[PDB]
């Protein structure tokens, strides 16, 4: 019972990727270094 | 070599360094081997004291 009325119109990774993976940000080491030097002084 | 006193001493040393490395089962196995070899020769008082 196919629905032919509606026409049926690289990154080949197997693991499930969560939305946060797409979010861009600096490395955690950089963030930790920045926070450490901010709170150090 | 049949010099089992040296073998007992070395087995005890192996058990000691295994225990110092937190590898408790391996230290226990080395100590058990040392005791098995020790109950086949005359252990001097120093060697028996180290064993105990």
């Amino acid at each position: 019972d196919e629905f032919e009325e509606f026409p049926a119109e690289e990154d080949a990774h197997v693991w499930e990727d969560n939305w946060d993976d797409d979010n861009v940000e600096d490395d955690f080491s950089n963030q930790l270094r920045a926070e450490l030097e901010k709170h150090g002084y | 070599m049949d010099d089992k006193a040296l073998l007992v001493e070395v087995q005890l040393l192996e058990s000691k360094t295994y225990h110092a490395l937190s590898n408790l089962p391996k230290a226990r196995a080395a100590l058990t081997s040392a005791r098995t070899t020790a109950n086949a020769i005359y252990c001097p008082p120093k060697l028996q004291a180290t064993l105990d």
């Binding site: 490395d27 930790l32 | 408790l24």
Partner: protein, 380 residues
């Protein structure tokens, strides 16, 4: 036991060279060039030169090509001699040697087809296992997901028919490495913990590297009781960690709830993990999961805590801890909510009955959707 061909160190060095900040590195280049010139690896030299836009040395390349050609002629001559004068065993050994040389000199497709032909001619079960392990090593070297999966299935089936414990342990190590490669960290931790006491696959990596991988993956996979029983109190793990103070500190800081040292060690671990050829794409995921794990572990023992308390415990500022907490709650990872006026995080851990009711609602909804679909299918 098994030969180190192909060398995974070569793949690690190539990946490190492909990295931006290590692209201009020289020591990696020197070590890789030394490995290639000790192995006379011409086709992989061409592949690396075209991938990295390197300037090919014509003299060295021609010497490598001539050496490969004369060696291949020698193996072909030995194969012909075995076929004419000797039995199937000698021709089989000659074909295995030819395939091994093809994989050694960096040929991918040639090694694949030669090993496939050998497997077609291979009869002895141990030699079939060895050929399948060689194919798995090649797939790991080239990160060929389909090849690795097919050869893993083949090896599992072969071991199920007839499997010695040594080859089964090696297959466990290979499966753990692949599971790490596909971010399936739970299975990787299972396999690495099962094989840590009897690790013999030194061709894949050294014992210290395997143990560091095991510690990382077990930390990201196991809960607190399993981590304490199998990793914190692990005999061999502690023995090797006595020679790895950084990894030991990273592991023990989370278990002992020393969160500032844990965060610093996690930054160090992330820096190590970025350069790793095998843990490459999952370093952000691993770091995020570790941050979530630390936050949840701290919040498990508290009902309501000041944001300043977390800032002091993790050794960070109030703003950073607030931002990370908000991002992780928004993703539904931490059972808490923030009162920014008082700057107090209040945990919202469901009780046993509420969690059981929610799980019942979810599972029953799925089962009732299945039941409705089935009934509508069958009742016409």
């Amino acid at each position: 036991g098994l030969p180190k061909n192909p060398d995974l160190r070569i793949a690690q060095l190539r990946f490190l060279l492909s990295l931006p900040e290590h692209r201009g590195d020289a020591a990696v280049r020197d070590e890789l060039m030394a490995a290639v010139r000790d192995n006379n690896m011409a086709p992989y030299y061409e592949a690396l030169c075209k991938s990295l836009d390197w300037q090919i040395d014509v003299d060295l390349l021609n010497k490598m090509k001539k050496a490969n050609e004369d060696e291949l002629k020698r193996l072909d001559e030995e194969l012909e001699d075995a076929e004419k004068n000797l039995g199937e065993s000698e021709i089989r050994d000659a074909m295995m040697a030819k395939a091994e040389y093809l994989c050694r000199i960096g040929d991918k497709e040639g090694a694949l087809t030669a090993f496939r032909k050998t497997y077609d001619k291979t009869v002895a079960l141990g030699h079939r296992l060895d050929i399948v392990f060689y194919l798995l090593r090649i797939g790991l070297f080239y990160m060929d997901n389909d090849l690795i999966t097919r050869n893993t299935e083949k090896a599992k089936s072969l071991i199920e028919e007839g499997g010695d414990w040594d080859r089964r342990n090696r297959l466990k190590v290979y499966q753990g490495l692949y599971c790490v490669a596909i971010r399936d960290f739970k299975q990787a931790a299972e396999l690495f913990l099962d094989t840590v006491s009897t690790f013999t696959s030194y061709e894949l990596m050294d014992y210290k590297t395997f143990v560091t991988y095991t510690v990382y993956v077990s930390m990201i996979a196991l809960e607190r009781p399993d981590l304490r029983e199998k990793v914190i109190k692990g005999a061999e793990i502690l023995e090797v960690l006595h020679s790895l103070p950084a990894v030991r500190q990273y592991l023990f800081s989370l278990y002992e709830c020393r969160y500032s040292v844990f965060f610093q060690s996690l930054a160090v671990v992330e820096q190590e993990m970025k350069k790793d050829w095998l843990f490459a794409p999952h370093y952000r995921y691993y770091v995020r999961e570790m941050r979530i794990h630390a936050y949840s572990q701290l919040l498990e023992s508290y009902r309501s805590l000041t944001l300043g308390y977390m800032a002091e415990a993790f050794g960070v500022g109030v703003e950073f801890i607030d931002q990370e907490l908000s991002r992780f709650i928004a993703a539904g990872r931490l059972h808490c909510k923030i009162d920014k006026v008082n700057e107090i995080v209040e945990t919202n851990r469901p009780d046993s009955k509420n969690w059981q009711y929610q799980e019942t609602i979810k599972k029953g909804d799925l089962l009732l959707n299945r039941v409705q679909k089935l009934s509508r299918v069958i009742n016409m």
